Design a binder for these strands. Structure first.
Ligand SMILES: [Mg+2]
Ligand SMILES: [Mg+2]
Ligand SMILES: [Mg+2]
Ligand SMILES: [Mg+2]
Ligand SMILES: [Mg+2]
Ligand SMILES: [Mg+2]
Ligand SMILES: [Mg+2]
Ligand SMILES: [Mg+2]
Ligand SMILES: [Mg+2]
Ligand SMILES: [Mg+2]
Ligand SMILES: [Mg+2]
Ligand SMILES: [Mg+2]
Ligand SMILES: [Mg+2]
Ligand SMILES: [Mg+2]
Ligand SMILES: [Mg+2]
Ligand SMILES: [Mg+2]
Ligand SMILES: [Mg+2]
Ligand SMILES: [Mg+2]
Ligand SMILES: [Mg+2]
Ligand SMILES: [Mg+2]
Ligand SMILES: [Mg+2]
Ligand SMILES: [Mg+2]
Ligand SMILES: [Mg+2]
Ligand SMILES: [Mg+2]
Ligand SMILES: [Mg+2]
Ligand SMILES: [Mg+2]
Ligand SMILES: [Mg+2]
Ligand SMILES: [Mg+2]
Ligand SMILES: [Mg+2]
Ligand SMILES: [Mg+2]
Ligand SMILES: [Mg+2]
Ligand SMILES: [Mg+2]
Ligand SMILES: [Mg+2]
Ligand SMILES: [Mg+2]
Ligand SMILES: [Mg+2]
Ligand SMILES: [Mg+2]
Ligand SMILES: [Mg+2]
Ligand SMILES: [Mg+2]
Ligand SMILES: [Mg+2]
Ligand SMILES: [Mg+2]
Ligand SMILES: [Mg+2]
Ligand SMILES: [Mg+2]
Ligand SMILES: [Mg+2]
Ligand SMILES: [Mg+2]
Ligand SMILES: [Mg+2]
Ligand SMILES: [Mg+2]
Ligand SMILES: [Mg+2]
Ligand SMILES: [Mg+2]
Ligand SMILES: [Mg+2]
Ligand SMILES: [Mg+2]
Ligand SMILES: [Mg+2]
Ligand SMILES: [Mg+2]
Ligand SMILES: [Mg+2]
Ligand SMILES: [Mg+2]
Ligand SMILES: [Mg+2]
Ligand SMILES: [Mg+2]
Ligand SMILES: [Mg+2]
Ligand SMILES: [Mg+2]
Ligand SMILES: [Mg+2]
Ligand SMILES: [Mg+2]
Ligand SMILES: [Mg+2]
Ligand SMILES: [Mg+2]
Ligand SMILES: [Mg+2]
Ligand SMILES: [Mg+2]
Ligand SMILES: [Mg+2]
Ligand SMILES: [Mg+2]
Ligand SMILES: [Mg+2]
Ligand SMILES: [Mg+2]
Ligand SMILES: [Mg+2]
Ligand SMILES: [Mg+2]
Ligand SMILES: [Mg+2]
Ligand SMILES: [Mg+2]
Ligand SMILES: [Mg+2]
Ligand SMILES: [Mg+2]
Ligand SMILES: [Mg+2]
Ligand SMILES: [Mg+2]
Ligand SMILES: [Mg+2]
Ligand SMILES: [Mg+2]
Ligand SMILES: [Mg+2]
Ligand SMILES: [Mg+2]
Ligand SMILES: [Mg+2]
Ligand SMILES: [Mg+2]
Ligand SMILES: [Mg+2]
Ligand SMILES: [Mg+2]
Ligand SMILES: [Mg+2]
Ligand SMILES: [Mg+2]
Ligand SMILES: [Mg+2]
Ligand SMILES: [Mg+2]
Ligand SMILES: [Mg+2]
Ligand SMILES: [Mg+2]
Ligand SMILES: [Mg+2]
Ligand SMILES: [Mg+2]
Ligand SMILES: [Mg+2]
Ligand SMILES: [Mg+2]
Ligand SMILES: [Mg+2]
Ligand SMILES: [Mg+2]
Ligand SMILES: [Mg+2]
Ligand SMILES: [Mg+2]
Ligand SMILES: [Mg+2]
Ligand SMILES: [Mg+2]
Ligand SMILES: [Mg+2]
Ligand SMILES: [Mg+2]
Ligand SMILES: [Mg+2]
Ligand SMILES: [Mg+2]
Ligand SMILES: [Mg+2]
Ligand SMILES: [Mg+2]
Ligand SMILES: [Mg+2]
Ligand SMILES: [Mg+2]
Ligand SMILES: [Mg+2]
Ligand SMILES: [Mg+2]
Ligand SMILES: [Mg+2]
Ligand SMILES: [Mg+2]
Ligand SMILES: [Mg+2]
Ligand SMILES: [Mg+2]
Ligand SMILES: [Mg+2]
Ligand SMILES: [Mg+2]
Ligand SMILES: [Mg+2]
Ligand SMILES: [Mg+2]
Ligand SMILES: [Mg+2]
Ligand SMILES: [Mg+2]
Ligand SMILES: [Mg+2]
Ligand SMILES: [Mg+2]
Ligand SMILES: [Mg+2]
Ligand SMILES: [Mg+2]
Ligand SMILES: [Mg+2]
Ligand SMILES: [Mg+2]
Ligand SMILES: [Mg+2]
Ligand SMILES: [Mg+2]
Ligand SMILES: [Mg+2]
Ligand SMILES: [Mg+2]
Ligand SMILES: [Mg+2]
Ligand SMILES: [Mg+2]
Ligand SMILES: [Mg+2]
Ligand SMILES: [Mg+2]
Ligand SMILES: [Mg+2]
Ligand SMILES: [Mg+2]
Lengths: 71, 117, 122, 137, 204, 52
RNA sequence: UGUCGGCUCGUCGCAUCCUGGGGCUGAAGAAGGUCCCAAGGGUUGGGCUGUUCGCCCAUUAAAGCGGCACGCGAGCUGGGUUCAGAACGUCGUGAGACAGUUCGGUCUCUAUCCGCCACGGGCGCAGGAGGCUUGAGGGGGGCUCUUCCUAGUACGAGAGGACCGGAAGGGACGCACCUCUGGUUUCCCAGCUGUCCCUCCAGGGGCAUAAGCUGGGUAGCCAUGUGCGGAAGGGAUAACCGCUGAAAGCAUCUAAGCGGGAAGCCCGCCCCAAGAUGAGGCCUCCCACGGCGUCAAGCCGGUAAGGACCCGGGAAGACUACCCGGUGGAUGGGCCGGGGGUGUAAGCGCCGCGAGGCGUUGAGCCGACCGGUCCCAAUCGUCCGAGGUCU
RNA sequence: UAGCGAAAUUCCUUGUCGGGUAAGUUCCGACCUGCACGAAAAGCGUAACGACCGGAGCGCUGUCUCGGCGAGGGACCCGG
């Protein structure tokens, strides 16, 4: 986590005067690698944060399994 | 702000211009003319010029006053009666006087542009 | 005056022909640049297989401006167009022969290397 | 205090009358006291007159010329203490005041557009070589 | 603390040694002392300096007595100069030497009821996409309910200019005593005829 | 009818107060060289005349 | 109780991004790390996207975070979202539906009150009146980089590279100004077209804008243009360095006391300012009631010093105020001289079949700038206005 | 199935690669991993034609750096 920067902001798309104010679209980024993943489909930040992170995990994994098996 | 310039005028170029010319023609026709305070003050300067320009002679000066006043008969008079009368009267060829009246409806301050004598 | 997005001609033979000013190198937030100043710019066109090709982000020093330069001695001088010379971080022209007049201002900036190759040091 | 003018004209003791006539539409070269690296020189400037801005003192004039493909113009304070010698070379027809229009077509037409003022041409060459013989004997 | 009155007469440019320098022309005619107020007689040190002559009939005011109190030709204007009791009965341009820097206070030109943009050189507004209603308009001024008011002194349009402006460290150029003239470094407040004062700047 | 709308009916007390300086100012007249009629300063007059 | 983002205007916080100072360092020096002090000021232009966000280019001393209804729609925008149309994927037998996309889609001339920016009227200031002032209190302003000198010295194997003291230049920003450069300059000057007219030719006007088009332009206003500002310096102080120094024989920067020390604070600079009803001070000018009021509290017509009205007029100005002038006069206007702009008038003569060309000619025309002169016009006169309480 | 395909359809998504630019969530070429194309609620394509929607370039310009001046109709003062 210490190398994973979490950024929040106003979602994009329909949602009435809700979406306009109620932001909380999560977007994470792995500083050392510079690979960010974002998500703004759910109505709740945390719900998205969980996705974002866990997804990143999946990304990095295959990136590690990539080089690991590459060697 | 920017009245550092010369005088003042209402309407628009063409208009105000024709205005001066008209009040000039009329003025040199009757001598004693009544209008508003400003219209007079400004008209005063304009006319005097034409008179002094008429104080001259050469037909060039003539044709020059023919740019403002169109009536050849009128300008003709200027170089015959008007100009000579004011011989040796350099500057101030006309007089402006305040009138006590006040045009009804708009409360306009009338005046008089009198040909000095 | 030369600002970003400005097209300058090329007074030298660095191969470049026209370059657009990407930025003016000066104080934190400059606003303009005149003869003698140096600016980051991009080559928008250049001679075939020149020393520098289209899209090369180089630093260059102004040599001529359309905006007349004021002289401390009341004098004034204005050019027909705006051009410069691609330079090195060493502040020396990447190319040699630099045709087209320059200015005496370039002299007080240390670009004598330029002025020596500049025929008309006006 | 009614000398608003003369006052400005008093400090105006920097005047200079060692300067010939020249109306827009005639080429002329001026030797300017231009300082080199550290020394002083007189870089010659050979061009035609475009602008002449008369305003009593500090009344300047401009001179544009062709230089190795580029056109360069220069505005000179008329009574500048750095104008060594302003020399006339050729006078021509004006028919204008500020003739920037030459910028447009600076070609062999700019020559037939700016004629040769034989009027001043005669007066010049004549008065020169005529008054010379007078200063002689 | 040198101090002498004068009026802006105009400005052109001279040539120092071989360089051009724009300069302003002030006129510092003789300014007769009128009242050397000491701390005993008041509380501060100063001098009343007169100026232009006068039609003795216009000054029928008690000013007559004040003038006679020091015995001087009825001047037109007279102000004070804090901390400055020199000598003689009159100050002149001899006070300033070509090289000393001076402070000149004047009355800026009145720009009448000037617009915000003209006044505080604002930004204005979009000339294109935006509604032709706010081109030269301050736009916003405050916040919502909090604070609910306006910060006192908020830059707004209105009558601007025609006030007391002090320019500083203008170097004294060529001064000609032969006519009570004085030359300075150009940029001087007030029109061509405004009453200005010239003092001693504070470099150190 | 639009945004610009008064909030309360200006008290009849404030109204009059407002019109404080609203009062007029009598014209200016002086005796004339001709009759005793009172001409406006720097002006001629009907049923009076002038000179020069 | 109008909802994103943008624009405009900001202001406040400090948990400081920069510049300021300082402690420790795994601090040689440079450069940096971390913590403390410290908002006064500053805190860029651009590519992509409705975006906020972020990514990127180029630079930067730095490209701070956050509050103000995630400030600001009676200031603006309307790309987004948030109606009707339409469509694709899509779920639904369907009608329809979708924090799933796509194209389009009406933001309302008048401000009463508070508040804020400007300006005036009234009274007040225990006499009247003119000029000049005091500074309580408040406002403004507070930025910074770069080269070189000291010295390539101290430090260092080397490459590098200091403190401190001094100089020069530049950016952004503020104030003011028109000398210069540059802009506008609505009739200042000229050229040109179509046409209608004066008057047939020449010459000349209107109209083609609210200038017909074009070439150029003083004064004025003005920035791209010019000048000048941040500072010095005194004082107190922050974190901190240190002194004398006991509690506590030693020790200790503190517990008494004392010194040094911040872009910060107070003062200094600039601007307002005695409605500072706590109405300040100075210099000068005019002075008695002349009559009722027994007293006390007041009134009345005339006055003084002096002011007001009116008039000509102003780089001052919406209005008003401000400012000079008002025949004991240059206030404006006209006229003359000049500066200035335009760029050989008109007429006549000469050359050419002719359009035209040459001379007369730097001619004519000529707004504001600078100055002169009483030809015109500020004629004349009216009102107000202490006579100053008590001990 | 053909054909087409991060598409008026692709949630993850600014997919990845190439091109255009100094820099390109848009744009164009391409791959296929098609959340959610697909053959008459037609599939793929197509000269010409749209005040249709997107991208780029040239020319040019007060759109912008950034604003300044000027004209006129209001606003402002007086009389109704
Ligand atoms: Mg919906
Ligand atoms: Mg909100
Ligand atoms: Mg919410
Ligand atoms: Mg909520
Ligand atoms: Mg969902
Ligand atoms: Mg005005
Ligand atoms: Mg017209
Ligand atoms: Mg005139
Ligand atoms: Mg290419
Ligand atoms: Mg060099
Ligand atoms: Mg050479
Ligand atoms: Mg050479
Ligand atoms: Mg001299
Ligand atoms: Mg000379
Ligand atoms: Mg040829
Ligand atoms: Mg103005
Ligand atoms: Mg301005
Ligand atoms: Mg300003
Ligand atoms: Mg601002
Ligand atoms: Mg703007
Ligand atoms: Mg609109
Ligand atoms: Mg609309
Ligand atoms: Mg509207
Ligand atoms: Mg609101
Ligand atoms: Mg009542
Ligand atoms: Mg009444
Ligand atoms: Mg702002
Ligand atoms: Mg430090
Ligand atoms: Mg440190
Ligand atoms: Mg050390
Ligand atoms: Mg080390
Ligand atoms: Mg502050
Ligand atoms: Mg932008
Ligand atoms: Mg763009
Ligand atoms: Mg683009
Ligand atoms: Mg976009
Ligand atoms: Mg954007
Ligand atoms: Mg991002
Ligand atoms: Mg970068
Ligand atoms: Mg904020
Ligand atoms: Mg909001
Ligand atoms: Mg809002
Ligand atoms: Mg709105
Ligand atoms: Mg909004
Ligand atoms: Mg609101
Ligand atoms: Mg719309
Ligand atoms: Mg859109
Ligand atoms: Mg939509
Ligand atoms: Mg179905
Ligand atoms: Mg849309
Ligand atoms: Mg839309
Ligand atoms: Mg309307
Ligand atoms: Mg109001
Ligand atoms: Mg107060
Ligand atoms: Mg104070
Ligand atoms: Mg060494
Ligand atoms: Mg050594
Ligand atoms: Mg060694
Ligand atoms: Mg050693
Ligand atoms: Mg050594
Ligand atoms: Mg070395
Ligand atoms: Mg060190
Ligand atoms: Mg330098
Ligand atoms: Mg100027
Ligand atoms: Mg100019
Ligand atoms: Mg004309
Ligand atoms: Mg015309
Ligand atoms: Mg015609
Ligand atoms: Mg007709
Ligand atoms: Mg002819
Ligand atoms: Mg004809
Ligand atoms: Mg007509
Ligand atoms: Mg007709
Ligand atoms: Mg015409
Ligand atoms: Mg017509
Ligand atoms: Mg018409
Ligand atoms: Mg024109
Ligand atoms: Mg022009
Ligand atoms: Mg001008
Ligand atoms: Mg204006
Ligand atoms: Mg500027
Ligand atoms: Mg400083
Ligand atoms: Mg500086
Ligand atoms: Mg200090
Ligand atoms: Mg110790
Ligand atoms: Mg002890
Ligand atoms: Mg101890
Ligand atoms: Mg210790
Ligand atoms: Mg303790
Ligand atoms: Mg300090
Ligand atoms: Mg200090
Ligand atoms: Mg203070
Ligand atoms: Mg009595
Ligand atoms: Mg009493
Ligand atoms: Mg009065
Ligand atoms: Mg008076
Ligand atoms: Mg009088
Ligand atoms: Mg006069
Ligand atoms: Mg006059
Ligand atoms: Mg006049
Ligand atoms: Mg001239
Ligand atoms: Mg001729
Ligand atoms: Mg002949
Ligand atoms: Mg022939
Ligand atoms: Mg002919
Ligand atoms: Mg004419
Ligand atoms: Mg003249
Ligand atoms: Mg007289
Ligand atoms: Mg006379
Ligand atoms: Mg009375
Ligand atoms: Mg009385
Ligand atoms: Mg008594
Ligand atoms: Mg007693
Ligand atoms: Mg594709
Ligand atoms: Mg998406
Ligand atoms: Mg992408
Ligand atoms: Mg790939
Ligand atoms: Mg790509
Ligand atoms: Mg690419
Ligand atoms: Mg590329
Ligand atoms: Mg582009
Ligand atoms: Mg790319
Ligand atoms: Mg394949
Ligand atoms: Mg299906
Ligand atoms: Mg389908
Ligand atoms: Mg199907
Ligand atoms: Mg089917
Ligand atoms: Mg298709
Ligand atoms: Mg097609
Ligand atoms: Mg159709
Ligand atoms: Mg269509
Ligand atoms: Mg605009
Ligand atoms: Mg205007
Ligand atoms: Mg206007
Ligand atoms: Mg108007
Ligand atoms: Mg009315």
């Amino acid at each position: 986590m210490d190398e994973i920067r979490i950024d929040v902001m106003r979602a994009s798309g329909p949602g009435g005067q809700g979406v306009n104010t109620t932001d909380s679209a999560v977007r994470v980024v792995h500083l050392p690698t510079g690979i960010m993943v974002t998500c703004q489909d759910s109505r709740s930040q945390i719900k998205n944060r969980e996705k974002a992170l866990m997804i990143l995990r999946s990304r990095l994994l295959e990136m590690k399994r990539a080089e690991e098996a590459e060697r | 702000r920017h009245l550092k310039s010369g005088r003042k005028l209402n309407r628009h170029s063409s208009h105000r211009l024709a205005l001066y010319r008209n009040q000039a023609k009329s003025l040199l026709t009757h001598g004693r003319i009544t209008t508003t305070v400003p219209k007079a003050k400004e008209l005063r300067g304009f006319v005097d010029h034409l008179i002094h320009l008429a104080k001259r002679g050469d037909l060039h000066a003539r044709r020059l006053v023919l740019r403002d006043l169109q009536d050849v008969k009128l300008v003709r008079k200027l170089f015959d009666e008007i100009a000579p009368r004011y011989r040796d009267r350099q500057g101030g060829y006309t007089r402006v006087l305040k009138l006590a009246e006040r045009r009804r409806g708009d409360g306009a301050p009338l005046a008089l542009v009198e040909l000095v004598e | 005056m030369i600002q970003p997005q400005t097209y300058l001609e090329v007074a030298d033979n660095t191969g470049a022909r026209k370059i657009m000013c990407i930025r003016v190198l000066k104080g934190s937030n400059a606003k303009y640049a005149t003869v003698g100043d140096v600016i980051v710019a991009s080559v928008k066109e250049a001679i075939p297989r020149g020393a520098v090709k289209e899209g090369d982000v180089v630093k260059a020093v102004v040599v001529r401006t359309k905006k007349e330069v004021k002289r401390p001695d009341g004098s004034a001088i204005r050019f027909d167009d705006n051009a410069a010379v691609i330079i090195n971080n060493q502040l020396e022209p990447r190319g040699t022969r630099v045709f087209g007049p320059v200015a005496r201002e370039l002299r007080e900036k240390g670009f004598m290397k330029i002025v020596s190759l500049a025929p008309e040091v006006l | 205090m009614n000398r608003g003018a003369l006052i400005k004209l008093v400090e105006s003791r920097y005047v200079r009358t060692d300067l010939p006539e020249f109306r827009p539409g005639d080429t002329v070269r001026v030797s300017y006291k231009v300082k080199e690296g550290n020394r002083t020189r007189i870089q010659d400037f050979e061009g035609i007159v475009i602008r002449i801005r008369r305003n009593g003192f500090n009344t300047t004039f401009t001179v544009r010329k062709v230089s190795y493909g580029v056109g360069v113009e220069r505005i000179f304070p008329l009574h500048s203490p750095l104008i060594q010698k302003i020399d006339i070379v050729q006078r021509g027809r004006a028919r204008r005041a500020k003739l920037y229009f030459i910028r447009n077509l600076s070609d062999r037409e700019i020559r037939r557009k700016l004629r040769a003022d034989r009027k001043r041409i005669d007066k010049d060459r004549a008065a020169e070589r005529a008054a010379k013989e007078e200063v002689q004997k | 603390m040198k101090g002498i009155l004068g009026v802006k007469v105009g400005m052109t440019r001279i040539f120092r040694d071989d360089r051009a320098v724009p300069v302003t022309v002030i006129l510092a005619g003789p300014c007769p002392v009128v009242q050397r107020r000491t701390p005993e007689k008041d509380g501060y040190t100063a001098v009343q300096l007169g100026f232009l002559p006068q039609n003795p009939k216009r000054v029928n005011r008690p000013l007559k007595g004040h003038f006679a109190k020091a015995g001087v030709e009825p001047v037109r204007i007279l102000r004070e100069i804090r901390d400055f009791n020199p000598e003689g009965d009159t100050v002149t341009v001899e006070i300033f030497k070509p090289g000393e820097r001076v402070d000149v206070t004047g009355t800026s030109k009145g720009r009448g009821f000037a617009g915000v943009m003209k006044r505080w050189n604002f930004a204005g507004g979009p000339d294109s996409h935006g509604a032709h209603k706010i081109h030269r308009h301050p736009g916003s001024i405050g916040n919502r309910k909090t604070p609910g008011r306006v910060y006192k002194g908020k830059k707004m349009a209105g009558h601007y200019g025609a006030e007391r402006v002090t320019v500083m460290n203008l170097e004294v150029v060529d001064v000609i005593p032969e006519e009570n003239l004085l030359l300075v470094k150009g940029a001087v407040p007030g029109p061509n005829g405004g009453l200005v004062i010239v003092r001693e700047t504070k470099k150190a | 009818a639009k945004h610009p709308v008064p909030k309360k009916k200006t008290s009849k007390a404030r109204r009059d107060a407002r019109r404080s300086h609203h009062a007029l100012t009598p014209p200016i007249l002086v005796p004339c060289p001709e009759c005793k009629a009172m001409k406006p300063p720097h002006t001629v007059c009907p049923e009076c005349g002038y000179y020069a």
